[PDB]
Subunit: 540 residues, 3 copies
């Protein structure tokens, strides 16, 4: 499955996105003078430059400290360091050669080494996007420079110039290959006060700013005076061009010119029997969002020459009268689609307040850890756990609490290549939470169904009863079409009714957010009462 | 109204459904070679087998106990039982013949009888679905067998075989008809340790696995190599068939063969003037979701024979050129509909976390109690209350709390055929909650509008002011189209501004979930402070 | 920007709307006998009658009191009042002529004047809707009469008749123009016990009940026996008419007759070459929602006379066979649109529980303060603050709390024309909250991005780091199409993992509503434990 057992709440800081307010959907206005043509849509290119980075730090018990040049050489060559922080030493000892032992990193390709005072090394990935303004490490620390900054190149670099240096012919030793003496590299070093950071300088690579996105074989152009609106039959996509006369192609985009000549020729060749070219040269357009649109206008051949009114006039009139009706309908579909995207954006913005992790995982169709960092959402991979160790606990009653029960089953698991066993609670879709705070007052009778991939675990009275296939429980569609529409069963929790008849004040488990809201002001007044009573108890 | 006054939170466990992750929407790919034809869609049949069940239990003050065979005979014939639990007796008395009195059940057809130790009988419905793997009683107790299990039949039965027995020629007495001596039955008995359960064994009924769902009079079949995609013009429904050559009909489904011969002949007869049959026999297809699709391919007659280019060629070209364009548009509409259903499923999954009862009631268009039982939603009827007794309290200030007021109006009501009067708070759409915890700090001025079906109750200063028709308040659409778009009124709560200017720390009522979220961490730190201060007060 | 810095939570009571349950979408049923025609849709007219109102009150320390006729004359002419409340006087003094000083109102055109006992005047707007049943003042106080009630006119008036009077030739003085002696007016007075209210009686204006809404140039009418369903090609709008024979126009709507004659003639004149009129007179229809629909049926000219089968018959058959297919598709699009609106209404109803302010602001596309007043939503303008004074605080660590940090940046601001400086927290989209309760436990490392219009503020370690343009962070669409689809970075919060490995019980910041829900029952049990421990501490 694409949603394996995973811990997602450990994900600190990943790729950022924001919800676009003020999405604008055009009004077609005067809607005659449609013209057909090929549209190639080009999107800004993003290259995920992922590169291996070594982090060096001193941990002190908790203040942290960078590592100087002489000690980082000893770390990279011998994995030895010097037990002190510049002054106290571990166990209040004396400054001595202290040897780093290896330690598991939880991601693919992350390796930690850790020997009061503690030397620490972390091999880890960092990723950067096409503009190369910054790169984010697995720790979530962000560095405000290009990873290709050579120092002399004056490429984007906002950190302290004194903190950055580059050393040639640098030697680095692989921990289990200490005698192989690997080939030398050119390696950069950065001092951030909290930690030293080092990475290999790969001479910056070269790429073309625009990557091809879509080819729409027939599109309808509507000239609304200030803008051209392009309506695409494939999908329902709509493009608003802010200029009426197409711009000559900027030379930086000239890598496109071959691709457009090829795609236009290949696709026009399959269409020659139905259309003639309106222009000998492609017209280029730029959208406000920065998409480049390549437009080849085509004029349809009259049906007489496709390779009291007389028949031909009636046929051409009917054909043109229905083509225009289809074009109007496609335009209204594109406008409806634009408005629906505008409303989806708001719906997603609101659902992200309920749970960003699940919202994003549903958008992607794969497990992604999502964290709301104020007004931006960060998306990242979850921490994988090795699924052979994942075992649910058969009983979910809280040990040593006659009045408390777990509302989610306990899970025992181990991190990949980690011997230590950890315990947590099974969230939704094999998610594992490093918490045991999902508890509820033990009901006299309870039925709970928890889905763990292709199997559902059925718990009666907080004890594991059976495992059933997912097909044992109808999906929403099958439910509404099947016996979900029949006379629903009438249920009475007679125990709850008697309890309310005998103690109207009694507390009960909340089951939904709206119940939290309905209780909230009463609970806040209860807290205020606690505060006042405690202050009076202290005063007396 | 379909949303009468009701108590929904008493609903323990009803019909279960789950939100289907990984809904797959196909890509049409190579899109020529459309063919038209009739499509009959058949869906798996669900029969709601609802049957009357008698429950027997001993309640002890609270341990519960089943009832033996000799005492259940005395209950079913005389409604007498024996006051003891096998040992203590009610009022620490002595084992004696003790007579059950009748008691109201709150659902249609539920009747309770109840005389430390308490004999209890409950006539109640149980419902089961077409696979007959289990049946759920009104209490919410689920039994893991088919209600048609004859013991010897080896039909699905997972309970303890020692606990189940069947007795012939069993006699049962109706409480108010004790002299009528009803005809005998064959009745099954089950011991679940907590309770005995009994029901009449109706010889298992017979039915055909597939129920007809839809007939689509014209559909477009696209052969995408591995699958056939069926696009239906009525609605926007889409069906993905995992096989390219249609399977011969399984004999178990042969009940369909007459229905398909009839529907295909009846509907082709109205279409003969436009199409000819491509095949002499219907082709059957099965979807991954288990729908059976009956497909009659049709080939359209040329327009010449429907009962420099020459005219006929132009007419046929235009007709075929526009039919293909409509077919492409219908395919894109079906794909858009599939994606929109995929996104609706996520939206509903998230809104169910806000409030499943209201979400489900809106989906059904009728009052349904919905409870999230972990990862599955249970849907059931709400408990009806007799609407002649429902009276709102004219004042919603909390009695004996100068600083507290009710945020929802109080409701006095009686359960159907119950003399006892109960008091609660009016939730949304005539829902009644068995709680009075929806309270708020009394505002100096307040306006609240509560809708109770076709009338809105307007409360000024926590006192009932007037009742207005629902038409007195514009709907969202009428609002946005009417004066909602004008210059909105500018309001200043000057009292709130002065309060904040004079006590920046002062507490205020929360009005929405996002305000709960914004306060939550501060309230948690307040609770932690309470805990630390109380521990220090105890230590001193 | 349309979302300036603003305080929205001060908005007490504005225009009300409700979510329409039981939106009905028709079934087309028998679908032949389409007919084309022009449809004019007329909607009920709403006029926002906004008028200037003066409020008079005595504030007492806090009981409030109206002002008598002799003292209101002295307020309106000299802005003098008499320091007493009928008896105690400010500073326990003696009844004396006491002079009102001016004070800023926070809305455009609101002016307050305020000299134990405090005379108070408030010039403020009040707005009323077309039916003139009530008008709402800026304070949020609602008055149950028409503002055009002349006393003798017996126009809608539900307040106490003794409380209302009208005085001719009334003189009112402008505070800074005390010598100009403005022209007299006819002014009404109302005593509400809490406050006196006064406004100018402008003889009620006259208007026509129906305002033109839309003209749909081609629409499809389907006669479903009981109703006519109108499907409009522009947009996807659908109208259900409850009558099959159109009603003769009520005389009250006769103002429409000229507009319809003009629009029908102007639009038919552009269509004569394609259609002939089916009737010589427009047919009027009324929807259940009260829309008036003007219908001119048109019959299309045969293609022969638009100004073995023979060609003309084939051409007409093809044209009619495709027009019917387009009409069926438009009908299915209109039904899908109706169902989608029905589902949007539920989605919006649920999202309003998360945050009505943001939901409504997204619907309007402009900043609107929204407050849920039970089952109705009130919408109003937010209080503007003068944006030249808005300065974010560079540091968001809580002063004097080593363990607490602010989760939203602090904002210093001044109200328009107010010298006083106020401090609060920056909510979403330049919203300012008069609170400082959004706090969190200081994380060892934190990254937060807050958007403030066209700029994003980036805070590292609770200290302001940089400001970036909105284009520095990809929108959701650009994200999903760009590097958001690449291999996401794998992040480990190693500190969190160590903390959980060493103290499984440790508390953590909640980041979403579902985390509130997961913690809620455990926090409620913690509160209950606090209560029990405090009661035992008091008992001992
Ligand atoms: C603990 O013992 C280590 C043993 O290495 C001491 O490290 C030494 O630290 C000094 C500076 O305090 C280094 O001096 C350096 O010399 C190089 C030139 O070789 C120069 O480029 C540097 O800027 C610096 O002046 C020295 O190299 C370094 N290592 C050795 C081999 O002595 C460390 O200072 C002792 N102190 C603590 C904090 O316990
Ligand atoms: C309280 O008084 C009742 C009076 O009925 C006692 O019920 C009796 O219980 C015994 C078993 O303790 C029953 O014996 C049974 O005999 C039948 C055959 O007739 C056999 O099939 C059963 O397996 C069982 O051996 C007895 O029938 C039953 N009723 C009578 C009429 O005596 C009850 O035991 C007394 N005890 C308590 C718990 O207070
Ligand atoms: C404080 O001093 C003011 C000074 O104005 C007193 O106001 C006076 O109040 C009396 C009623 O208590 C007013 O009598 C009124 O006479 C008019 C006719 O001129 C009549 O229409 C009213 O119904 C009422 O009978 C009087 O006009 C008013 N002003 C003057 C100039 O004396 C006030 O009563 C003193 N008392 C308090 C509460 O401190």
């Amino acid at each position: 499955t694409s949603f394996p057992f995973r811990v997602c709440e450990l994900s600190s800081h990943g790729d950022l996105f924001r919800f676009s307010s003020d999405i604008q959907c055009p009004s077609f206005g005067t809607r005659e003078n449609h013209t057909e043509g090929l549209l190639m849509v080009f999107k800004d290119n993003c290259i995920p430059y992922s590169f291996k980075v070594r982090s060096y730090t001193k941990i002190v018990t908790e203040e942290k400290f960078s590592v100087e040049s002489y000690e980082t050489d000893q770390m990279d060559t011998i994995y030895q360091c010097y037990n002190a922080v510049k002054v106290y030493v571990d166990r209040d000892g004396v400054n001595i050669t202290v040897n780093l032992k290896p330690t598991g990193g939880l991601c693919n390709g992350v390796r930690r080494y850790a020997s009061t005072v503690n030397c620490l090394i972390t091999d880890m990935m960092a990723k950067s996007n096409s503009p190369f303004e910054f790169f984010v490490t697995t720790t979530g620390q962000t560095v405000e420079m290009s990873p290709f900054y050579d120092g002399k190149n004056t490429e984007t670099f906002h950190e302290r110039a004194d903190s950055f240096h580059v050393r040639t012919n640098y030697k680095i030793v692989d921990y289990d290959n200490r005698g192989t003496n690997p080939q030398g590299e050119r390696r950069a070093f950065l001092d951030k006060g909290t930690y030293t950071l080092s990475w290999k300088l790969e001479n910056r690579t070269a790429y073309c700013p625009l990557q091809h996105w879509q080819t729409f074989d027939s599109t309808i152009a509507t000239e609304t005076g200030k803008s051209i609106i392009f309506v695409t039959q494939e999908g329902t996509s709509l493009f608003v061009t802010n200029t009426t006369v197409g711009i000559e192609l900027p030379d930086a985009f000239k890598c496109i010119e071959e691709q457009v000549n090829k795609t236009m020729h290949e696709k026009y060749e399959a269409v020659q029997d139905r259309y003639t070219k309106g222009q000998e040269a492609i017209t280029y357009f730029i959208t406000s969002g920065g998409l480049l649109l390549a437009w080849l206008p085509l004029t349809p051949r009259s049906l007489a020459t496709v390779k009291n009114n007389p028949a031909t006039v009636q046929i051409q009139f009917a054909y043109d009268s229905l083509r225009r009706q289809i074009n109007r309908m496609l335009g209204d579909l594109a406008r409806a689609w634009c408005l629906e995207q505008k409303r989806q954006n708001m719906v997603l913005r609101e659902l992200t307040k309920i749970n960003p992790t699940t919202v994003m995982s549903s958008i992607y169709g794969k497990a992604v850890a999502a964290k709301r960092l104020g007004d931006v959402i960060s998306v990242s991979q979850c921490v994988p756990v090795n699924q052979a160790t994942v075992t649910l606990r058969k009983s979910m009653r809280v040990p040593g609490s006659e009045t408390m029960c777990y509302s989610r089953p306990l899970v025992s698991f181990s991190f990949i290549n980690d011997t230590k066993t950890y315990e947590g609670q099974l969230g939704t879709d094999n998610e594992i939470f490093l918490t045991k705070k999902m508890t509820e007052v033990c009901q006299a009778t309870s039925q709970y169904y928890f889905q763990s991939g292709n199997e559902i675990h059925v718990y009666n009275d907080y004890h594991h009863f059976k495992t059933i296939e997912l097909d044992g429980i109808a999906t929403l569609q099958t439910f509404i079409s099947g016996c979900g529409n029949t006379s629903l069963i009438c249920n009475i929790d007679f125990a709850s009714l008697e309890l309310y008849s005998r103690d109207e004040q009694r507390a009960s488990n909340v089951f939904d957010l709206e119940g939290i809201f309905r209780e909230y002001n009463f609970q806040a007044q209860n807290i205020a009462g606690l505060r006042k009573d405690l202050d009076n108890a202290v005063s007396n």
